[PDB]
Assembly symmetry: C3
Homo-oligomer: 186 residues x 3
Amino acid sequence: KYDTRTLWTTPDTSPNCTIAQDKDSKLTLVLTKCGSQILANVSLIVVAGKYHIINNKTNPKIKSFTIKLLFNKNGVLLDNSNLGKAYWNFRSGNSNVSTAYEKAIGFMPNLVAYPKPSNSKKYARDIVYGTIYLGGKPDQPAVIKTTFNQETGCEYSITFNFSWSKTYENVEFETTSFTFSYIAQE
Amino acid sequence: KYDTRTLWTTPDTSPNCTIAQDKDSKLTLVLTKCGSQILANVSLIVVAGKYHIINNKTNPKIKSFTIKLLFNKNGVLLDNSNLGKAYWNFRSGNSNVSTAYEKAIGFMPNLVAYPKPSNSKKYARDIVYGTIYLGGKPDQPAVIKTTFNQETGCEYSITFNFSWSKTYENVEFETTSFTFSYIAQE
Amino acid sequence: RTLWTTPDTSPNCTIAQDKDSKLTLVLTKCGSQILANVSLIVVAGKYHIINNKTNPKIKSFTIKLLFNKNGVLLDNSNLGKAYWNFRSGNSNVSTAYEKAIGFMPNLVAYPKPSNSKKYARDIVYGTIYLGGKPDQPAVIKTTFNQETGCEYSITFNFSWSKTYENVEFETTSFTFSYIAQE
Ligand SMILES: CC(=O)N[C@H]1[C@H]([C@H](O)[C@H](O)CO)O[C@@](OCCn2cc(CN(Cc3cn(CCO[C@]4(C(=O)O)C[C@H](O)[C@@H](NC(C)=O)[C@H]([C@H](O)[C@H](O)CO)O4)nn3)Cc3cn(CCO[C@]4(C(=O)O)C[C@H](O)[C@@H](NC(C)=O)[C@H]([C@H](O)[C@H](O)CO)O4)nn3)nn2)(C(=O)O)C[C@@H]1O
Ligand SMILES: [Cl-]
Ligand SMILES: [Mg+2]
Ligand SMILES: [Mg+2]
Ligand SMILES: [Mg+2]
Ligand SMILES: [Zn+2]
Ligand SMILES: [Zn+2]
Ligand SMILES: [Zn+2]
Ligand SMILES: [Zn+2]
Ligand SMILES: [Zn+2]
Ligand SMILES: [Zn+2]
Ligand SMILES: [Zn+2]
């Protein structure tokens, strides 16, 4: 059956995301609608390019990057997002429904909770911080900062900024999972 | 909506909470019922009075404060709570249903999991800890400690204690969001 | 919709000796994701009172839940089967469940051990606090489907790095989620 309460990337490892080069990563993102809140589960695997293997010995200034999901007024993912549109859809089993969705407003971050930009200092409640671990190692933390509706050129957005303090020496950027939630638009 | 699965403060910024003076803050709290667990999402904006701008040079020992939600046997908010009664109801759209609810036991913290204070041994599982960030700045952590059913003068309670260890100088007390869950009474 | 240990404090888990602990675990199915809430009370034995001045090398322990093709708990799990069932009130359904595959950790998200690249996404880390004291953290590492001799697994490793002196191992609560098998 069509799982109309889940919007996801599918849980496979095929690259679906472009951070620095085309399809250099798998963002695994599952949004499950529990009424007024979306329960969100996220991880990242970088498979190629600039962020695949971190070396802060050779490149000490490379300490963060950003993955943006931008949505229009109907909750449809915009082309300029880092996440590709071909496997972002409602769930069917371990895959997606066949028809590209036309409406997902119920999965969008609430605009009264998280107003869009701006020319307006905004309240911090539109941010959630967490920590994930590279390679599952407990001494390899990175910060995942999630921000709602702070991108311009869209109606809604979810942004993930990944950052770290440690001087990583050939560490592959693939992460443990993090769960959060946010208030839904409808 | 008439969303009988969500009890909330609404997502607006109208001050609804009294910490040190009348309506000096907006507590944004959303309780969403996923069967036997309540999914909770919380943030705080202090808009005026003593806790609005922290200055620990002027006030070295102001390092914490508490917001309490106290409930009767039917799950109805009691007026000694810091959150105002007019701001707390079942969801309708971005607003509240027009008349106060009579029962919300399904939203109350489970008394077997989290007993009221008594002569019996108190267990730590009635607490959840998280860290939120003032102004969304990653060097401005504060701890949110949430405690279930540990107030007297009520049948159920949810208490939020906000505290910090750093010496903050002119830092605005408005927070990022935190998600947690707890076991429901019914 | 809810698989759980019941929320009472009667011991149901064997870490170092028979029924030395109460694992309170609640798994609620929100569709494609399981919402999980976990805490631990150790009541007796080696892990009840931590004293790292006396015993410097007692710094971690593991609790394993092993499941077969049907989502049924295998009896070599640390958690006892008598206690683990679908909710009815504050107790359990009268009969033992035959099926809960919809509560199992998804095997494409979280594959069993293999001879291919092993990804970290099958781990969730959190911190809980012993005695509810903010200066007594311990790490709770949760891992999906990485045990052998089972179809599915959930494992909780508890560890700490501070030198605790006479600290009772009873934790605050931690919530996490994971992608469901179906
Ligand atoms: C409830 C609660 O929160 N309790 C905490 C209490 C409590 O606040 C007080 O007791 C009051 O009640 O405090 C604990 O800490 C006591 C204080 N303490 C002692 C130490 C040793 N060092 C020192 C240190 C300090 N800094 C400051 C920079 O840090 C921040 C900041 O700017 O303030 C913290 C922010 O949260 C962070 N922001 C974000 C968004 O993340 C920022 C940010 O990153 C930067 O600003 C950049 O923008 O930074 N730095 N050092 C702290 C310390 C401890 N270690 C041990 C080794 O570290 C790790 C590791 O990397 O290996 C961390 C890792 O996450 C962890 N892994 C896991 C899975 O948990 C591992 C692991 O435990 C071991 O490796 C074993 O495998 O350890 N290094 N440096 N710091 N603070 C307390 O009382 O114990 C903590 C308690 O939770
Ligand atoms: Cl009022
Ligand atoms: Mg909705
Ligand atoms: Mg102490
Ligand atoms: Mg299912
Ligand atoms: Zn790689
Ligand atoms: Zn297009
Ligand atoms: Zn290491
Ligand atoms: Zn302000
Ligand atoms: Zn001001
Ligand atoms: Zn600063
Ligand atoms: Zn004890």
